[PDB]
Design a protein around this motif. Structure first.
Motif, PDB file in Angstrom:
ATOM      1  N   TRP A 104       1.724 -18.690  21.827  1.00 60.33           N
ATOM      2  CA  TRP A 104       2.953 -18.339  21.131  1.00 60.33           C
ATOM      3  C   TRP A 104       3.014 -18.885  19.710  1.00 60.33           C
ATOM      4  O   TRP A 104       3.797 -18.369  18.906  1.00 60.33           O
ATOM      5  CB  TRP A 104       4.166 -18.821  21.929  1.00 60.33           C
ATOM      6  N   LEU A 125       2.219 -16.164  17.294  1.00 60.40           N
ATOM      7  CA  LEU A 125       3.332 -15.247  17.088  1.00 60.40           C
ATOM      8  C   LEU A 125       4.347 -15.827  16.112  1.00 60.40           C
ATOM      9  O   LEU A 125       4.862 -15.115  15.243  1.00 60.40           O
ATOM     10  CB  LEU A 125       3.994 -14.922  18.427  1.00 60.40           C
ATOM     11  N   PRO A 170      11.190 -16.936  15.600  1.00 62.30           N
ATOM     12  CA  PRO A 170      11.331 -15.582  16.156  1.00 62.30           C
ATOM     13  C   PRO A 170      12.771 -15.106  16.212  1.00 62.30           C
ATOM     14  O   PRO A 170      13.020 -13.908  16.042  1.00 62.30           O
ATOM     15  CB  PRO A 170      10.720 -15.717  17.556  1.00 62.30           C
ATOM     16  N   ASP A 190       9.559  -5.905  18.183  1.00 62.64           N
ATOM     17  CA  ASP A 190       8.822  -5.109  19.154  1.00 62.64           C
ATOM     18  C   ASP A 190       7.423  -4.787  18.659  1.00 62.64           C
ATOM     19  O   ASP A 190       6.452  -4.879  19.417  1.00 62.64           O
ATOM     20  CB  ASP A 190       9.602  -3.822  19.427  1.00 62.64           C
ATOM     21  N   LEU A 247       5.238  -7.970  18.723  1.00 62.36           N
ATOM     22  CA  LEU A 247       4.918  -8.303  20.108  1.00 62.36           C
ATOM     23  C   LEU A 247       3.881  -7.345  20.676  1.00 62.36           C
ATOM     24  O   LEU A 247       2.946  -7.767  21.366  1.00 62.36           O
ATOM     25  CB  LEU A 247       6.181  -8.280  20.965  1.00 62.36           C
ATOM     26  N   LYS A 248       4.029  -6.050  20.392  1.00 62.93           N
ATOM     27  CA  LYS A 248       3.093  -5.061  20.908  1.00 62.93           C
ATOM     28  C   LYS A 248       1.700  -5.261  20.327  1.00 62.93           C
ATOM     29  O   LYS A 248       0.706  -5.203  21.057  1.00 62.93           O
ATOM     30  CB  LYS A 248       3.609  -3.654  20.605  1.00 62.93           C
ATOM     31  N   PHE A 287       0.302  -8.854  21.870  1.00 62.41           N
ATOM     32  CA  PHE A 287       0.139  -9.085  23.298  1.00 62.41           C
ATOM     33  C   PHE A 287      -0.507  -7.927  24.049  1.00 62.41           C
ATOM     34  O   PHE A 287      -0.801  -8.078  25.238  1.00 62.41           O
ATOM     35  CB  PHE A 287       1.497  -9.408  23.933  1.00 62.41           C
ATOM     36  N   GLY A 312      10.832  -6.923  23.344  1.00 65.93           N
ATOM     37  CA  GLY A 312      11.373  -8.269  23.318  1.00 65.93           C
ATOM     38  C   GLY A 312      12.511  -8.493  24.287  1.00 65.93           C
ATOM     39  O   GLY A 312      12.805  -9.643  24.626  1.00 65.93           O
ATOM     40  N   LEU A 314      11.580 -14.945  24.850  1.00 65.74           N
ATOM     41  CA  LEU A 314      10.802 -15.487  23.739  1.00 65.74           C
ATOM     42  C   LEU A 314      11.679 -16.119  22.668  1.00 65.74           C
ATOM     43  O   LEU A 314      11.454 -17.274  22.297  1.00 65.74           O
ATOM     44  CB  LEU A 314       9.935 -14.385  23.123  1.00 65.74           C
TER      45      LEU A 314
END
Lengths: 324, 310, 271, 268
Positions: free
Chosen positions: B38, B41, B63, B76, B79-80, B83, B155, B160
């Motif tokens: 994480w 991210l 975040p 989104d 994250l896409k 991950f 999300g 998160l």
């Protein structure tokens, strides 16, 4: 006996579609093993277990010398506990509750429905005795420590405590202080109750629609995500049929009400008959006493046999197990 | 090993035999499978929000700021693109499964535990959303308390951002209740956690509210490179934890987390058949534990005694 | 900037109306060289493991010391570190010259108390539970985290992780009074960071409130780097009006005193 | 009782007295009680005309099944009346309270304050707390109908008391702060009232001695039993009973209220 069976058959014949679907869902839960019964004070009353109003009567007698709103039933015992000592409270508990009462046929019906769990607000041992006779073991959880060391998969969860340890006021949820501090004092019990409700099919029997526990559970249910839970069934056995407004109000709150007074005609004080109407409807639905047309026979045999289409050959000794 | 470590091993193996063992798997086990951590991210979120690159609260706040400013769509997208990867399952996943846990609770939003269960042949009802609790097909759960990306790499499906953790109890009442019930009714072993994790301390805070002895102390497999300090060990064991330190058991490199995890996991697995009998007192205790229930019966068939001793 | 000008206009209006309340953080005390909490955590860590920090450690390490080393050692360390007399920096004088109706402070020191005693304005000092009921005056010097007036013991102050965890239960009257003062007054924050624990908890409590039912409190930022526009808008959407002293003028990377003084004396000269 | 009057008069002189006025004083002013509202809702619900939760559940059932429009219509046709202020309101004002906390949603206290010339900042909604322009407060914790005869402006049914803290955090905080920082005299409240129980439950959270014991004026026709009295002394309420002071009729509540109010006033 035979007349009662014929009357039950007739009642099922003109039963409302909603009630028929509720019965079918409850029976499907029973077959699936996902049925949990939430037994209230009414079922214990059907065996003439001492009701709480007599306890409040005695508390009022010792307090003011003379012999009740919703708050009084919790405050007067608290009045006794505060003004007098805990020893007197426990002594009154002991003299009222140290009795051995039989198990009414409604207990036998509940355990014949094959409940995965039995949650109850009853501090008596009637349900434990009923499970003991029928040969199925229920891990009785009535205190915090009982949650961690639960012997079996099936729980008999007495959320308001009981008197197995002793007839003391600290083992049970009776006075107003107990209800105010229930979440703090029973975290594990409340959590287990909520998990059982979330993961199982709940049928409330022996409860009034305006009972404190029902309102608290509906208050918890409102916090859940929409359609993320299954609406519990509520077996209502009041003398008078449920009002349409009250029915829609409580069904919008997340309850599927099976009203005993609406299904059958009975006397005002014939509570046992009202309980038995619904419980027997459920059982004879399980026992298939209500199928009569060739269409229902085909559907029943298909539901029993269609999974076996996966296999190639099934032993004739296995077909005996298939049809129970 | 140490006597208390051996007692912890005995308790874990006994729970595993009884089917009352539950594994609480953290981000450390997924990290050993190279699943994106994480902090990358948060690095990307800081890169988009500010010029170029944190605290414990920052890992959730940055975040949260990215969400509030750039949009759920941008959150989104990141994250896409971060991950949506395929990673192998660790041998540690297979070791956890070979322990035969009753449940696997996890804060991991990946499907690595799902892939391990599918590969090994374990069927678990995967509960990652609120509606999954009532729709669970079995009594054995793979409980992703922080959601996952099965519905989609959105999300809203996972915990998160900062707001997700603040509103977790409000947004996940059934999942949180189920997790706490599993903790209360089972034997819990924590693996993949750093003893300072947010989830670990939240669970220890909830444990504080419980009665003095109404719960069993969860086990904590600590796999930090350095052995735990004594004062930290007393502090966390007085909070309700029973810590098995991988660094104390064996010596390994600082960055060699795989062997640190594998030492404890293989020591647990190889102890499944072990009875821990060296002295005659242990022999008598084990045989008595096997035989004493038979004292109720007047006579035992000698051919039945092979079942008593398995 | 127009937004900034409207800001100082509204604090001056609130001060003139007597509805101004000042929220004092650790930076104001640090400006007078008060013993900071980081060095207390460093001493606790040195007495714990012998060799000397995330946000969680600042509350955990004192709690570890309290649990494993007892409370007598905790109180002894607190006494030996905080039993000092420090001069009041001009920031206290400028805050009191702004005529605040209430002074809510998270600092456990008596600096505000001595500053008020010097300035002649009597503030009812409320730092314990019993102080709420027996308040002599209407003006409150509300030490929401306690102080050492009763003694240099950790039970009187909110320092460890347990104290923050159980703050609402241990301090219901203090928290209620502070929330009421925030609701019915104009709040100006000094000595705090945007990532401060108490600031973000207050932002959460504000988010729980009804929209447009409260006055947005003023946050005065003395961080050396100018506030990022993204962070600025994020914290303004959360219910804060940020006056960045770093954006106001240019200063060094270690001169916090002039940074506080800029906003304080700008407010005073506007008044 | 004599000691109780001394504390009330002493705090009144200090100017930190606060009165918690209940529905009893409004009833003395012949304001429409909530029981008749529940009866009307029941009649429009079932057609034929009470438990403690019934007063809250029946309006909630009516709101759920009939809608907001019918609920507000009944509220308007039952509450949009003009009622003269009883002398007890004037006596309460004559005690010079620092703040007036009321569970009443009427303007009887507001009209009394306007008539006597005392300026109180009337707060009954969330926005009124921040925009109050006076030190004196008229805190209507349950709201009122100044905005309009709507059910949302008031706390009447269940799901309004259930979510009271969620929808009234500022008002509840101000009430608790005033209770903590001032002395409180309860008037027009029953001992088994829901609000009294809630405030006693909140007080039990407070540490011992940190709060001033609230004063409770009891005006029930029968004298208090010693056991219930001592129970509520232990709970935190200092009870002064009008029934014990003088001999009064069963339905003559006005003289019972006066026996305490005039006695308190003349002891200034």
């Amino acid at each position: 006996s035979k007349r009662y069976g014929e009357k039950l058959k007739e009642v099922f014949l003109m039963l409302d579609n909603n009630v028929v679907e509720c019965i079918k869902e409850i029976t499907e839960s029973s077959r699936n093993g996902k049925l949990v019964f939430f037994v209230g004070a009414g079922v214990s009353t059907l065996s003439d277990y001492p009701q709480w109003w007599r306890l409040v009567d005695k508390y009022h007698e010792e307090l003011y010398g003379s012999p009740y709103s919703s708050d009084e039933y919790l405050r007067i015992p608290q009045i006794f506990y505060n003004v007098k000592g805990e020893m007197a409270f426990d002594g009154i508990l002991k003299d009222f509750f140290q009795v051995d009462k039989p198990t009414n046929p409604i207990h036998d019906k509940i355990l014949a429905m094959n409940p995965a769990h039995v949650i109850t607000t009853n501090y008596d041992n009637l349900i434990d005795t009923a499970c003991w006779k029928r040969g199925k073991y229920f891990s009785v959880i009535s205190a915090e420590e009982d949650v961690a060391n639960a012997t079996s998969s099936r729980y008999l969860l007495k959320v308001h405590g009981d008197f197995r340890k002793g007839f003391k006021g600290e083992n049970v949820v009776l006075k107003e202080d107990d209800y105010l501090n229930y979440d703090q004092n029973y975290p594990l019990i409340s959590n287990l109750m909520k998990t059982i409700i979330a993961t199982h099919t709940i049928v409330f029997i022996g409860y009034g629609l305006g009972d404190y526990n029902i309102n608290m559970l509906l208050n918890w249910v409102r916090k859940l995500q929409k359609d993320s839970f299954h609406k519990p069934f509520f077996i209502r056995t009041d003398p008078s049929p449920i009002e349409n407004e009250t029915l829609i109000y409580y069904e919008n709150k997340g309850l599927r009400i099976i009203d005993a007074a609406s299904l059958i005609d009975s006397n005002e004080y014939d509570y046992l008959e009202r309980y038995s109407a619904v419980m027997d409807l459920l059982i004879e639905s399980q026992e298939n006493k209500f199928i009569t047309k060739d269409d229902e026979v085909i559907d029943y045999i298909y539901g029993k046999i269609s999974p076996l289409f996966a296999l190639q050959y099934i032993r004739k000794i296995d077909l005996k197990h298939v049809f129970e």
